[PDB]
């Protein structure tokens, strides 16, 4: 409960940003006007991160 990917994302093998069922993830803005930004373990995410949790 918080921002879950919606899905697992998975850039390309377990190296980039690679979410999987819902394991939520941190994250920097880009919830309304972007979403390609956010923080699984301190990073430049590039995940989607819509219709996630409309986190504030």
Same mark, same amino acid.
């Given at each position: 409960? %918080?921002? =879950?990917?919606?899905?697992?994302?998975?850039?390309?093998?377990?190296? $980039? +940003?690679?979410?999987?069922? *819902?394991?939520? %993830?941190? =994250?920097?803005?880009?919830?309304?006007?972007?979403?390609?930004?956010? $923080? +699984?373990?301190?990073?430049? *995410?590039?995940?989607?991160?819509?219709?996630?949790?409309?986190?504030?």
């Amino acid at each position: 409960e %918080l921002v =879950l990917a919606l899905y697992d994302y998975q850039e390309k093998s377990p190296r $980039e +940003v690679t979410m999987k069922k *819902g394991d939520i %993830l941190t =994250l920097l803005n880009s919830t309304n006007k972007d979403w390609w930004k956010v $923080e +699984v373990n301190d990073r430049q *995410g590039f995940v989607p991160a819509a219709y996630v949790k409309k986190l504030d």
